[PDB]
């Protein structure tokens, strides 16, 4: 381009609304606020969730549960994600990370059975579902619980 003929992409910029600059803008005197009360005032309005003294919704409902502080979460890889590999290749967690299927192996790797495998390989992970091990051994191949 030239620096004297710069042009933004179409529909990518917009001018901001400037409130309180006279009558014909449509936002002239009271500036969009209406006339009086709490919401007309500067710094006004009621804090979110407050409903005027009727008991709020998050006080009239009971608290339930607890949170387990050392819970395990596993990186999930499904069966149709394994078809990017070649037959007979032996997949391991470090190979699954390096190939970029798993970004962040949280507490381990669980293989789940969602897609269709359609290859033959040997896998090594921390956890398998039932259907996953069925479809891995059914095509020929072995699974080994690291």
């Amino acid at each position: 381009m030239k620096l004297h003929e710069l042009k933004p992409a179409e529909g990518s910029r917009k001018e901001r609304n400037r409130v309180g600059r006279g009558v014909a803008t449509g936002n002239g005197k009271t500036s969009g606020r209406g006339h009086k009360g709490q919401k007309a005032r500067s710094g006004g309005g009621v804090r979110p969730g407050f409903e005027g003294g009727q008991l709020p919704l998050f006080r009239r409902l009971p608290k339930r549960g607890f949170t387990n502080i050392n819970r395990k979460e596993y990186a999930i890889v499904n069966l149709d994600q394994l078809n990017k590999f070649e037959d007979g290749t032996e997949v391991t967690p470090a190979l699954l990370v390096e190939s970029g299927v798993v970004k962040n192996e949280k507490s381990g790797i669980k293989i789940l059975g969602n897609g269709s495998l359609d290859k033959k390989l040997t896998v090594k992970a921390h956890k398998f579902s039932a259907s996953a091990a069925e479809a891995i051994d059914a095509k020929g191949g072995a699974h080994e619980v690291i």
């Binding site: 381009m1 710069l6 933004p8 992409a9």
Partner: protein, 206 residues
């Protein structure tokens, strides 16, 4: 994708092959605008401030009593409608820079280069041989290659003599292959590159 390497007398020294991944894309005008806008905003220091009503000198006390006697009720002599001041929402010192993703940035550099190579704005020479700084010498060089007023010359890493030579012909700017930015590529009317430089920029953008 072939370009004539000229000598400093401007005749010819050969041809050269430069990628279409770098020098030959369809240039992207949106990413180019976005990167020009970015660089222009990273250059500004936002070194501007005013004094608000709590930072104007003086003015602690209420100037007359609330029910006055025939006067408007006022609270300090430094309120915004008084002539001593207190500014309501002025400038505040801030930064105007922002970032954008890495290979949008490389897309902008490619669009700038490939626009230069499509207006016949690209001249590749073989090496510059300057052993002492002389603007007069460099001026004769830019006359033999038919160059316009604004010209960006890209060496490979650092020629202190061609830097010092070209340094104040007005309109000429001298850069390293690593120091290419969109703003001066777009600002120049033509690009002269050495031979070693064009391989380097073809190898870091491809």
């Amino acid at each position: 994708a072939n370009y004539d390497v000229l000598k400093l007398d401007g005749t010819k020294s050969g041809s050269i092959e430069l990628s279409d991944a770098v020098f030959g894309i369809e240039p992207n005008n949106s990413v180019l605008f976005e990167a020009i806008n970015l660089q222009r905003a990273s250059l500004r220091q936002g070194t501007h401030a005013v004094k608000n009503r709590s930072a104007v000198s003086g003015g602690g006390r209420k100037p007359w009593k609330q029910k006055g006697t025939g006067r408007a009720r006022q609270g300090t002599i430094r309120a915004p409608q008084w002539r001593g001041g207190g500014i309501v929402f002025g400038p505040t010192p801030r930064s105007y820079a922002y970032k954008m993703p890495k290979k949008m940035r490389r897309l902008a550099l490619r669009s700038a280069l490939s626009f230069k190579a499509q207006e016949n704005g690209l001249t590749v020479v073989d090496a510059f041989n300057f052993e002492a700084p002389k603007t007069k010498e460099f001026k004769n060089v830019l006359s033999t290659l038919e160059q316009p007023k604004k010209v960006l010359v890209v060496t490979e890493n650092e020629d202190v003599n061609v830097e010092l030579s070209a340094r104040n012909i007005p309109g000429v700017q001298v850069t390293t292959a690593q120091g290419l930015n969109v703003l001066d590529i777009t600002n120049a009317d033509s690009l002269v590159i050495t031979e070693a430089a064009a391989k380097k920029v073809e190898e870091v953008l491809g």
